[PDB]
Amino acid sequence: NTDDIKALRVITAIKTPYLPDGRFDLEAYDDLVNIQIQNGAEGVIVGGTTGEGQLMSWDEHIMLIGHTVNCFGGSIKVIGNTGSNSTREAIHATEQGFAVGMHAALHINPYYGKTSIEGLIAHFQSVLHMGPTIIYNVPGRTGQDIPPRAIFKLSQNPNLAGVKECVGNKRVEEYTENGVVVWSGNDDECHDSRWDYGATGVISVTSNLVPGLMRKLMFEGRNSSLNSKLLPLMAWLFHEPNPIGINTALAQLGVSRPVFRLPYVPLPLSKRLEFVKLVKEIGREHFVGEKDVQALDDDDFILIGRY
Amino acid sequence: NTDDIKALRVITAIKTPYLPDGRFDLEAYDDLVNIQIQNGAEGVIVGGTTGEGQLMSWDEHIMLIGHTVNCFGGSIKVIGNTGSNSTREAIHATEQGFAVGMHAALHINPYYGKTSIEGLIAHFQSVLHMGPTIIYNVPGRTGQDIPPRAIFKLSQNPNLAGVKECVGNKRVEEYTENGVVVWSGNDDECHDSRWDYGATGVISVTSNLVPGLMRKLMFEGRNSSLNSKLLPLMAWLFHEPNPIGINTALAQLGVSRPVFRLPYVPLPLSKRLEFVKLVKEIGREHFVGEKDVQALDDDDFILIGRY
Amino acid sequence: NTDDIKALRVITAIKTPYLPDGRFDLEAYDDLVNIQIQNGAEGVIVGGTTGEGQLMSWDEHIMLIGHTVNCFGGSIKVIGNTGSNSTREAIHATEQGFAVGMHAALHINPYYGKTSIEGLIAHFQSVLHMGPTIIYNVPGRTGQDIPPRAIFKLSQNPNLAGVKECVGNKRVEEYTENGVVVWSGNDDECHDSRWDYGATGVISVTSNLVPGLMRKLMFEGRNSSLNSKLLPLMAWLFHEPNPIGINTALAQLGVSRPVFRLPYVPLPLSKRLEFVKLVKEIGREHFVGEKDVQALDDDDFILIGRY
Amino acid sequence: NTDDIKALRVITAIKTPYLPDGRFDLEAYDDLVNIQIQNGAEGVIVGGTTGEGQLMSWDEHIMLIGHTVNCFGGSIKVIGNTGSNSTREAIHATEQGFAVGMHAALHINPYYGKTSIEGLIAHFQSVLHMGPTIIYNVPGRTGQDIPPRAIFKLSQNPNLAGVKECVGNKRVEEYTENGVVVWSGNDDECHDSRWDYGATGVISVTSNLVPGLMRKLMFEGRNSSLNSKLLPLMAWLFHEPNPIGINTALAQLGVSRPVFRLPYVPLPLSKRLEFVKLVKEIGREHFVGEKDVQALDDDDFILIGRY
Ligand code: NA
Ligand code: NA
Ligand code: NA
Ligand code: NA
Ligand code: NA
Ligand code: NA
Ligand code: NA
Ligand code: NA
Ligand code: NA
Ligand code: NA
């Protein structure tokens, strides 16, 4: 049901942890999702940009969606990232994702092989009838900014829950004043987005580390001091393109193995030492896991091309 | 070998034509490649952006590469587009494409899931050892500008044939003054790139329509007035994102069926009528095929999502 | 848990119904599984021989397993047919099947590319540690009879629940007297298997049609008159190789569309008219669905090669 | 064309050799194919039962077919094993194999998921129109004997080159007396099949080891005493199911690494010592490779499940 999706305020784009041969580490993944549920996250994106959906084959991606539904689906909404630059793959992945029980789909506009606005309506109308859907706009990654007029045409459809918008707060405000539900896709704008520009909440990378504090930020009212205490951590997470930062941090916290699927590689030791300092300044009690944060050596990280 | 790739001036990024149910039309495709050869095209990109590689399953893509080598590889250089935003996919695709006899690989940087410069080097080093390689920079589509210092680093590998560059002539000139071979990836700049900025030639969309005129433009010296005559056709071809124009034009000339794989959809009737006038203005004798150019009705087009 | 698997007496090898384009018809499939649960079936095999697992790609097979777990897993045991003649595919399919929540795996010995008894131990030891497993012996289909000494070596493993045995009642008796749990794989021997030769129950094709009567046969004591009332129906179901008969019958009952994935084709009209007679003789009230049985025309059946 | 396939007498079902991690060893493979050509083998089956097609993903299989055509197709006929128990897979594999330039297809009847005779005709008619085809009957592996009346029906299609027959010489003679071309698929019968029962030649495992002697046996007339000399080697090659013997022997001769994809595992040391004596008895000069034959230690072998 679309209404239940519209009501979510804190959705985590969860990291996908790996075994040293490159396969998914499901035991670490289950720990991560349980920690999200214990700290009040309401939805998870499975295999989103942060979860490296772009590196998965479809069988391991549908497996990870079905696993998340089967183990956690009664305790958290499971939103499968089933969009694609290929309409055929978007159709196939979305209907299989809904068949294994996911609650909603996250759909990006076709990236790299971008299409016309007419082709973009055709793409989205291919999948929207399948179930509750959030459309995702991030032109810095896709090469194409979805214009609001396209979203307005698509919200005829009762399955469009709303938009994950990365353009910025002026675009968030244009949508929310036109009655479209919006989740900020930018951790470092989401507090203002929520309290000043009518956003419902955030689909977050930073909640992978501090899910309790992100929930506080979206639920307890304007808190501009909590916000600026999180800003240095947010900057660190985006120093190189996401998920490089989160992959590095979860490995330092010991909740994920230091295993990267290429083309991602970790942040260097100088940044890893800043992370040890950030954990101390914010307080280890707010971060996921209970192990002592480690700096790690560069040689701890396994970079895998063939898996 | 690499030197033979570096010598190519006219490389057509060939359109992939379809049967009425979405499968590849190999008879139409073979007609296109033969026409290219007969008009002096010296290389083809198989399954590039123009060839909708992004919409192919890997089995039909490797099949199209091996078929092109088997039928035409003694008459034209066959360059497989075996790049990906996933290093795993780029490694497998590339080694398999070389195993079936392609002469070179085209490698884009990771789009959408963009990585750090260090990750970008690791990605390209994963495939550069496999055979002659052209690196493709198109930040308008990928979200990321490959910096010259990464190219200078990678050019130490003797398998780097050069770069397909879309940033513009000032970037072309920075490479070519330093000894890196460049093909312009922008048809509307390629004449000046070739004669004024040291580009070896072009990896062209427009050559799918007027391969003889593109050949003349790359070999017979500066000719502003020929260039000026082609600019309106080139503008039309990129009115919407490629390959929407070329797919519409080739259906109008009768050399490809009017079948689109989504998310691409044809240009509207007013643009198709403009194309009929472009062909008459330039001269039908310069365009591929023998059939009279047609406007086509909207109803002639078949759009396919499930294939 | 293996003990819970050992205790099952009536497992249905459920048919996989199709839409006219060849995709799975999940709405019909859900009706079928609900009807099994309402008539007391205790387990279902998903994508077994009867379910045409051999014709599925792995993504649709894992999807169908995850779907069955998510919709029915609290009401019936879900046993994924994840075995293969390739050890690599067996490993991959089994661990993904268990990850989406299936309760057990059905594993055939490598068919067609058969291996030595030493290779067969190596194959099974690759997957047995993954969770509760039933080994399936059907030399009439595989070309290789698994010798009891191999099963005895493998029952060291607490995950081996038992064997689905198709060789016949003398082989069932050799296993059960040696303390191996056995499910008869032959509907027309399963009554004697159960009451005279120590079999626990049956993994059945016939239960797809008359699940209530098959449950009666396995639970209520020796009933040789009920058995011989079912014998003509059982013979009909195996007149050509299974699943040809069941696919034809479910279409006649209107619970499945008359759509066959090749290489299967339906029984001819003379056999379909015998089925109408069998339903009347046994009583429509005992068969799945509520629609009036139809003979169907040959032209009702859609035979699909490309899907 | 078909006539050129019908003329072949010596077809080697080539072994597929592996690198230490399970990937294909193309350098070893190319050495094997060159040795076959140099000893007068006239065709190769790529990825047949002997070549472990059953263990390949389709991408590596089409790659191996296109590679063989690209490197050797001007010197030897390349027959792809593109058959399957799934018609969908047989259709796709076969059309793609012909598109990359294979000269013929080898098609087994559906094994394990066996179908009715009518279904069997529908399966083969799905692929026979695609190019020259050899039908493979091996009921010991498939569970089903293709009846002569199905072959007589299918031979009306001019693309049927003939049959690889394993039932024995009486079945060979029934075909050949009626004008159907037969290759014996049984090495230990092929001499008599060739000279006494009208077989055109052999699709051979033993030719991977002694291709010159197999050629002599197929071209230079009856020679019982040469045949008798090879029988012990042929017996050894099928002591366990093929390809276990040939994979062990080629590792002992040094022309393939001692790497097995599961579920195959090497013959034990006593059989390997017997092989060293067979080579000495027949003469090393007749066996492929130049290196001294070795027994190998059990520890030299690498068995791989995950690759
Ligand atoms: Na804590
Ligand atoms: Na914690
Ligand atoms: Na120049
Ligand atoms: Na012309
Ligand atoms: Na022309
Ligand atoms: Na009833
Ligand atoms: Na009923
Ligand atoms: Na003869
Ligand atoms: Na020799
Ligand atoms: Na030799």
Side-chain angles (χ1 to χ4, degrees), chain B residues 223-254:
Chain B
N223 188 333
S224 278
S225 98
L226 177 52
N227 193 57
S228 285
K229 211 144 317 189
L230 290 179
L231 289 169
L233 175 63
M234 295 175 175
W236 184 95
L237 279 169
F238 293 86
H239 184 244
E240 292 296 355
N242 180 51
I244 281 158
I246 186 63
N247 292 349
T248 304
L250 293 166
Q252 294 184 249
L253 291 169

Short mmCIF file of all heavy atoms in Angstrom, two decimals, chain B residues 223-254:
data_model
loop_
_atom_site.label_atom_id
_atom_site.label_comp_id
_atom_site.label_asym_id
_atom_site.label_seq_id
_atom_site.Cartn_x
_atom_site.Cartn_y
_atom_site.Cartn_z
N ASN B 223 37.43 21.74 -44.97
CA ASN B 223 36.38 22.06 -45.93
C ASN B 223 35.18 22.58 -45.13
O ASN B 223 34.20 21.83 -44.80
CB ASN B 223 36.01 20.81 -46.71
CG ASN B 223 35.08 21.10 -47.85
OD1 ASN B 223 34.34 22.07 -47.79
ND2 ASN B 223 35.10 20.25 -48.87
N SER B 224 35.27 23.85 -44.75
CA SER B 224 34.24 24.48 -43.91
C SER B 224 32.91 24.44 -44.52
O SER B 224 31.88 24.36 -43.82
CB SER B 224 34.58 25.94 -43.69
OG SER B 224 35.50 25.89 -42.64
N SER B 225 32.89 24.50 -45.84
CA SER B 225 31.61 24.60 -46.46
C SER B 225 30.89 23.22 -46.47
O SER B 225 29.66 23.14 -46.28
CB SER B 225 31.76 25.30 -47.82
OG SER B 225 31.83 24.37 -48.85
N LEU B 226 31.64 22.14 -46.68
CA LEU B 226 31.05 20.82 -46.52
C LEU B 226 30.59 20.65 -45.06
O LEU B 226 29.45 20.22 -44.80
CB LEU B 226 32.02 19.72 -46.90
CG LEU B 226 31.53 18.28 -46.68
CD1 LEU B 226 30.18 18.02 -47.32
CD2 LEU B 226 32.59 17.31 -47.19
N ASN B 227 31.46 20.97 -44.10
CA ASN B 227 31.07 20.90 -42.72
C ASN B 227 29.71 21.63 -42.45
O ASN B 227 28.78 21.07 -41.85
CB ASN B 227 32.18 21.38 -41.80
CG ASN B 227 31.91 21.03 -40.35
OD1 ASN B 227 31.73 19.85 -40.01
ND2 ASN B 227 31.83 22.03 -39.49
N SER B 228 29.62 22.89 -42.89
CA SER B 228 28.42 23.71 -42.73
C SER B 228 27.18 23.05 -43.30
O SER B 228 26.12 23.12 -42.69
CB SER B 228 28.59 25.09 -43.41
OG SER B 228 29.44 25.82 -42.55
N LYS B 229 27.31 22.40 -44.44
CA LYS B 229 26.20 21.66 -45.02
C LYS B 229 25.69 20.50 -44.14
O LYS B 229 24.52 20.12 -44.21
CB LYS B 229 26.66 21.08 -46.33
CG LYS B 229 25.56 20.95 -47.36
CD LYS B 229 26.13 21.24 -48.75
CE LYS B 229 27.05 22.45 -48.73
NZ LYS B 229 27.43 22.86 -50.11
N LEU B 230 26.58 19.89 -43.37
CA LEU B 230 26.20 18.77 -42.52
C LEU B 230 25.69 19.19 -41.17
O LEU B 230 25.02 18.40 -40.49
CB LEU B 230 27.42 17.87 -42.36
CG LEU B 230 27.76 17.15 -43.65
CD1 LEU B 230 28.98 16.28 -43.50
CD2 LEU B 230 26.54 16.37 -44.14
N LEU B 231 26.03 20.41 -40.72
CA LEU B 231 25.63 20.82 -39.38
C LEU B 231 24.14 20.71 -39.07
O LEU B 231 23.79 20.32 -37.95
CB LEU B 231 26.16 22.21 -39.00
CG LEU B 231 27.69 22.23 -38.77
CD1 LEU B 231 28.20 23.68 -38.67
CD2 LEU B 231 28.11 21.42 -37.54
N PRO B 232 23.25 21.07 -40.04
CA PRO B 232 21.82 20.94 -39.73
C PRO B 232 21.44 19.45 -39.53
O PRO B 232 20.62 19.15 -38.66
CB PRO B 232 21.12 21.56 -40.99
CG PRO B 232 22.19 22.47 -41.55
CD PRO B 232 23.45 21.67 -41.37
N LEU B 233 22.00 18.54 -40.32
CA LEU B 233 21.72 17.12 -40.14
C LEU B 233 22.24 16.68 -38.75
O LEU B 233 21.54 16.07 -37.97
CB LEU B 233 22.40 16.30 -41.22
CG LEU B 233 22.28 14.79 -41.07
CD1 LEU B 233 20.81 14.34 -41.15
CD2 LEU B 233 23.11 14.16 -42.19
N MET B 234 23.48 17.02 -38.44
CA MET B 234 24.02 16.75 -37.10
C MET B 234 23.20 17.34 -35.96
O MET B 234 23.05 16.69 -34.91
CB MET B 234 25.45 17.27 -37.03
CG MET B 234 26.38 16.49 -37.98
SD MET B 234 27.97 17.35 -37.86
CE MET B 234 29.03 16.31 -38.86
N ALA B 235 22.68 18.56 -36.13
CA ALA B 235 21.83 19.13 -35.08
C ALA B 235 20.58 18.25 -34.88
O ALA B 235 20.18 17.97 -33.74
CB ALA B 235 21.39 20.57 -35.42
N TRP B 236 19.95 17.88 -35.99
CA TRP B 236 18.72 17.03 -35.96
C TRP B 236 18.93 15.68 -35.23
O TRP B 236 18.07 15.22 -34.44
CB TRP B 236 18.27 16.82 -37.40
CG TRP B 236 16.97 16.07 -37.54
CD1 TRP B 236 15.69 16.60 -37.68
CD2 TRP B 236 16.79 14.60 -37.59
NE1 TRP B 236 14.75 15.59 -37.80
CE2 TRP B 236 15.34 14.37 -37.76
CE3 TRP B 236 17.65 13.48 -37.53
CZ2 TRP B 236 14.79 13.09 -37.84
CZ3 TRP B 236 17.09 12.19 -37.59
CH2 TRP B 236 15.70 12.00 -37.76
N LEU B 237 20.11 15.08 -35.45
CA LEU B 237 20.51 13.78 -34.88
C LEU B 237 20.68 13.83 -33.37
O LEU B 237 20.67 12.79 -32.74
CB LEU B 237 21.80 13.25 -35.54
CG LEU B 237 21.61 12.56 -36.90
CD1 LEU B 237 22.98 12.35 -37.54
CD2 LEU B 237 20.80 11.23 -36.80
N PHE B 238 20.84 15.03 -32.81
CA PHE B 238 21.00 15.17 -31.38
C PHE B 238 19.95 16.08 -30.79
O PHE B 238 20.13 16.58 -29.71
CB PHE B 238 22.42 15.64 -31.06
CG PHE B 238 23.46 14.62 -31.41
CD1 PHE B 238 23.99 14.53 -32.71
CD2 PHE B 238 23.89 13.68 -30.43
CE1 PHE B 238 24.92 13.56 -33.05
CE2 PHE B 238 24.82 12.70 -30.78
CZ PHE B 238 25.34 12.65 -32.08
N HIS B 239 18.86 16.29 -31.52
CA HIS B 239 17.76 17.07 -30.95
C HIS B 239 17.27 16.43 -29.68
O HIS B 239 17.10 17.10 -28.67
CB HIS B 239 16.62 17.12 -31.96
CG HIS B 239 15.52 17.96 -31.50
ND1 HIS B 239 14.27 17.45 -31.25
CD2 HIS B 239 15.48 19.29 -31.14
CE1 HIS B 239 13.46 18.42 -30.78
NE2 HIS B 239 14.19 19.56 -30.72
N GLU B 240 17.03 15.11 -29.73
CA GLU B 240 16.85 14.31 -28.50
C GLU B 240 18.14 13.49 -28.26
O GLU B 240 19.01 13.39 -29.15
CB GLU B 240 15.64 13.37 -28.67
CG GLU B 240 14.29 14.08 -28.74
CD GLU B 240 13.88 14.85 -27.48
OE1 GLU B 240 14.57 14.82 -26.43
OE2 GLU B 240 12.82 15.49 -27.53
N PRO B 241 18.27 12.86 -27.10
CA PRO B 241 19.53 12.11 -26.87
C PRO B 241 19.73 10.97 -27.94
O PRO B 241 18.78 10.23 -28.26
CB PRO B 241 19.32 11.52 -25.48
CG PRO B 241 18.38 12.55 -24.80
CD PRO B 241 17.41 12.91 -25.90
N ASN B 242 20.93 10.88 -28.55
CA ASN B 242 21.29 9.73 -29.37
C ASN B 242 21.06 8.44 -28.53
O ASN B 242 21.42 8.44 -27.35
CB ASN B 242 22.80 9.89 -29.59
CG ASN B 242 23.38 8.79 -30.44
OD1 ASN B 242 22.88 8.48 -31.52
ND2 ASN B 242 24.50 8.24 -29.98
N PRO B 243 20.53 7.34 -29.14
CA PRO B 243 20.29 7.12 -30.58
C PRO B 243 18.86 7.42 -31.08
O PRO B 243 18.42 6.83 -32.04
CB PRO B 243 20.61 5.65 -30.74
CG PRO B 243 20.01 5.04 -29.48
CD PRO B 243 20.37 6.07 -28.38
N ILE B 244 18.11 8.27 -30.38
CA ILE B 244 16.71 8.46 -30.84
C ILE B 244 16.65 8.97 -32.30
O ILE B 244 15.84 8.48 -33.13
CB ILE B 244 15.94 9.40 -29.87
CG1 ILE B 244 15.51 8.62 -28.61
CG2 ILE B 244 14.75 10.07 -30.59
CD1 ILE B 244 15.24 9.53 -27.39
N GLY B 245 17.51 9.93 -32.63
CA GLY B 245 17.50 10.46 -34.00
C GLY B 245 17.93 9.45 -35.01
O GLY B 245 17.25 9.25 -36.04
N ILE B 246 19.06 8.79 -34.75
CA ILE B 246 19.58 7.87 -35.79
C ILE B 246 18.59 6.69 -35.99
O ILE B 246 18.39 6.20 -37.14
CB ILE B 246 21.04 7.45 -35.53
CG1 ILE B 246 21.59 6.62 -36.69
CG2 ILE B 246 21.18 6.56 -34.27
CD1 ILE B 246 21.61 7.45 -37.98
N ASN B 247 17.96 6.26 -34.91
CA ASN B 247 16.98 5.13 -35.03
C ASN B 247 15.81 5.65 -35.88
O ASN B 247 15.31 4.89 -36.72
CB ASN B 247 16.37 4.67 -33.68
CG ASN B 247 17.39 3.98 -32.73
OD1 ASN B 247 18.50 3.66 -33.13
ND2 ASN B 247 17.00 3.82 -31.45
N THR B 248 15.37 6.90 -35.65
CA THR B 248 14.23 7.41 -36.46
C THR B 248 14.67 7.53 -37.98
O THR B 248 13.99 7.05 -38.90
CB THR B 248 13.78 8.75 -35.93
OG1 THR B 248 13.44 8.65 -34.56
CG2 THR B 248 12.54 9.28 -36.72
N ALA B 249 15.84 8.14 -38.23
CA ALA B 249 16.32 8.38 -39.58
C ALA B 249 16.52 7.11 -40.37
O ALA B 249 16.15 7.05 -41.54
CB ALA B 249 17.67 9.09 -39.51
N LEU B 250 17.17 6.10 -39.78
CA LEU B 250 17.38 4.87 -40.49
C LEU B 250 16.04 4.14 -40.85
O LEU B 250 15.96 3.52 -41.92
CB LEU B 250 18.37 3.94 -39.74
CG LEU B 250 19.82 4.43 -39.64
CD1 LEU B 250 20.56 3.58 -38.60
CD2 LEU B 250 20.52 4.27 -40.97
N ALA B 251 15.04 4.20 -39.97
CA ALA B 251 13.69 3.70 -40.32
C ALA B 251 13.14 4.54 -41.52
O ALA B 251 12.59 3.97 -42.47
CB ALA B 251 12.75 3.85 -39.14
N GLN B 252 13.32 5.86 -41.49
CA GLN B 252 12.81 6.71 -42.63
C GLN B 252 13.46 6.44 -43.98
O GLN B 252 12.80 6.57 -45.02
CB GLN B 252 12.91 8.22 -42.33
CG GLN B 252 12.00 8.67 -41.20
CD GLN B 252 12.05 10.15 -41.00
OE1 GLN B 252 12.57 10.65 -39.99
NE2 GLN B 252 11.51 10.90 -41.99
N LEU B 253 14.75 6.09 -43.98
CA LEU B 253 15.48 5.69 -45.16
C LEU B 253 15.23 4.25 -45.57
O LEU B 253 15.75 3.80 -46.60
CB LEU B 253 16.99 5.82 -44.93
CG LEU B 253 17.51 7.27 -44.80
CD1 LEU B 253 18.94 7.18 -44.32
CD2 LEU B 253 17.42 8.02 -46.14
N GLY B 254 14.49 3.49 -44.76
CA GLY B 254 14.18 2.12 -45.14
C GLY B 254 15.23 1.07 -44.90
O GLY B 254 15.09 -0.05 -45.40
#
